[PDB]
Amino acid sequence: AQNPNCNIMIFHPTKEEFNDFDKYIAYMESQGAHRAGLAKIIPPKEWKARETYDNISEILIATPLQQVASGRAGVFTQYHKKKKAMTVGEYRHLANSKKYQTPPHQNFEDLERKYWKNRIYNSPIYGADISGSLFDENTKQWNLGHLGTIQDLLEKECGVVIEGVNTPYLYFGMWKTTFAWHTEDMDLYSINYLHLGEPKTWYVVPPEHGQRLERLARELFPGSSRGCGAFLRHKVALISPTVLKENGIPFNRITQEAGEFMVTFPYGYHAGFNHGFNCAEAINFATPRWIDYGKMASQCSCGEARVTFSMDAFVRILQPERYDLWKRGQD
Numbered sequence: 001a002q003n004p005n006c007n008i009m010i011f012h013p014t015k016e017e018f019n020d021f022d023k024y025i026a027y028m029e030s031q032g033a034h035r036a037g038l039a040k041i042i043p044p045k046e047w048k049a050r051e052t053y054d055n056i057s058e059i060l061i062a063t064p065l066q067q068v069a070s071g072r073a074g075v076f077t078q079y080h081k082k083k084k085a086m087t088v089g090e091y092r093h094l095a096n097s098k099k100y101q102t103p104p105h106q107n108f109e110d111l112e113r114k115y116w117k118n119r120i121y122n123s124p125i126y127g128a129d130i131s132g133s134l135f136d137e138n139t140k141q142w143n144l145g146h147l148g149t150i151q152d153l154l155e156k157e158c159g160v161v162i163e164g165v166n167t168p169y170l171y172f173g174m175w176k177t178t179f180a181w182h183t184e185d186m187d188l189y190s191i192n193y194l195h196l197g198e199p200k201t202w203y204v205v206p207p208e209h210g211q212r213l214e215r216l217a218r219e220l221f222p223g224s225s226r227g228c229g230a231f232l233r234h235k236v237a238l239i240s241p242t243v244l245k246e247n248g249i250p251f252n253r254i255t256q257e258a259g260e261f262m263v264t265f266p267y268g269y270h271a272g273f274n275h276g277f278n279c280a281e282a283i284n285f286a287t288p289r290w291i292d293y294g295k296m297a298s299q300c301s302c303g304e305a306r307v308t309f310s311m312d313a314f315v316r317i318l319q320p321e322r323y324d325l326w327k328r329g330q331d
């Protein structure tokens, strides 16, 4: 069995290996990369996502989200308070302001310590989930707007044609902006490219141990757990590495820098934070190996998780028993 300790693997494809996206994912899995839940891919030196980032300031963040925390430093939830629209240039200036800018620090580890000590005492503003792409149309390799669609994969594997579309999303971050512990919708893969700016630190639980993290979360968030049998689908709960170590939960950590891709694998729980002003692009995708995970994915039916149009068909075809209850949650 490859990668039996479930370590995060880092890959350096050549320009020739970067041509065929599906084939490279399957290669990484042949080496055990999925066992970690997360892998890093450093593009060949010849590759670029676009020519420059000099002309992005007029992108609109229609609904910036202020991430307000409650709890204790290592165990907290966050809610998202909607703020007035602002452009990317306005948001960058805000991120760089004395109130929001990254503090002086020695290295990534010192910054990680400061994040976990102090996060809860501040409310950073995140431009998340903005439909669009920063890949140049002429970039043919690993262009997250040109991937094979999940609807086409389901049709190729299972024969059933379904409605829905699959497009990428932009994230504009600042110091302390936070992504809560989650797996993807329908336990899909994700791919995330950090286009510019400061790093993103990730934490991940191996898929084979995801139920250990769920059982800890039910203990640490007991009201939320009574409200919903899949409350981590709400994407609001944070648990620190120190607390994970105290409770014996297997995990790994890694820092992504600008110009690097991260892939999350089916049922790989992940969480993390941004070091400073940055912009990332991400999308979900599927492979043949996903289908079995999609069929077994938990679902939120309490009303909180509310998701895209395209998840309807996935539930309807892969989980027909759950469909009626899940759809009530959506309505």
Ligand SMILES: O=C(O)CNC(=O)C(=O)O
Pocket (backbone or CB within 6 Å): 171, 178, 179, 190, 191, 192, 200, 264, 270, 280, 282, 283
């Ligand atoms: O970058 C972020 O805020 C969150 N991204 C992801 O959870 C991802 O790419 O799967």
Ligand SMILES: [Mg+2]
Pocket (backbone or CB within 6 Å): 055, 056, 057, 058, 059
């Ligand atoms: Mg612009």
Ligand code: NI
Pocket (backbone or CB within 6 Å): 182, 183, 184, 190, 264, 270
């Ligand atoms: Ni994710």
Ligand SMILES: [Zn+2]
Pocket (backbone or CB within 6 Å): 227, 228, 229, 230, 231, 233, 234, 300, 301, 302, 303, 304, 305
């Ligand atoms: Zn729920």
